[PDB]
Amino acid sequence: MKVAKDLVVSLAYQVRTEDGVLVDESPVSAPLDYLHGHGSLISGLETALEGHEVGDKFDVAVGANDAYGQYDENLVQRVPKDVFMGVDELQVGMRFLAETDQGPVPVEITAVEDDHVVVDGNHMLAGQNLKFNVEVVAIREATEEELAHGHVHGAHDHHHDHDHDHHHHHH
Q1: Torsion over CA: 146, 149, 150, 151 (sign)
Q2: Domain locations in the chain?
């Protein structure tokens, strides 16, 4: 069975930016629990997750418009033109990958002053894409209650495991 609406699934994803830096993560040990087609997480991910079945693993790239990654003014700064020695001509409207304190940062020049240029990683609303490495743990058709409420009805465990056994389970 594949992931679709009113089905509920537990998936394990890792979200990092185009810069390479990790922002958040749901481990394979404990998934993100959500009811699909209800808007449980973000915009781009659910639809990307769709069609897949448990065990599928792949990285997804969704723009900040449909994911996280909203405007951050810490991502905009003024860099001395000297650093961009390899660049042809530091002009406004120019896009290039820039190596920075924070790794390679895909920015666009919005101005070029006397000695430094102005680049903002946030273009339209932000624009930077996020990369999610998704690991769909399980998929289940919901119990109606989950649908009626709009989310999972018994996802969070009270310990870790229940069926711990040290006997001969085969008989």
Answers
A1: negative
A2: 1-70+127-155, 71-126
Query: 72 - beta bridge partners?
Result: none
CA dist., res. 154 & res. 71, Å (int) = 35
Q: Please calculate the CA angle 149-33-156 and round it to the nearest 5 degrees.
A: 85
Burial of 118 (C-beta count, 10 Å sphere; 0-12/13-18/19+): middle
Q: What one-letter code names the amino acid at 109?
A: I
Rounded Cα gap, residues 145 and 122, in angstroms: 41
Name the experimental technique. NMR
Q: How far apart are CA 123 and CA 146, in angstroms?
A: 38
Pair 86, 96: CB distance under 8 Å? no
**CA gap 106, 111 in Å, rounded:** 16
The position carrying tokens 């920015």 is 107
In CATH terms, 1-70+127-155 corresponds, of 2.30.29.30, 3.50.30.20, 3.10.50.40, 3.30.9.10, to: 3.10.50.40
User: What is the phi/psi pair of residue 83, to 5°?
Assistant: -55, -35
Containing 7, the helix (H) or strand (E) segment is strand 7-17
Decide which of 1.20.1290.10, 3.55.50.30, 2.40.10.330, 3.30.43.10 is the CATH code for 71-126.
2.40.10.330
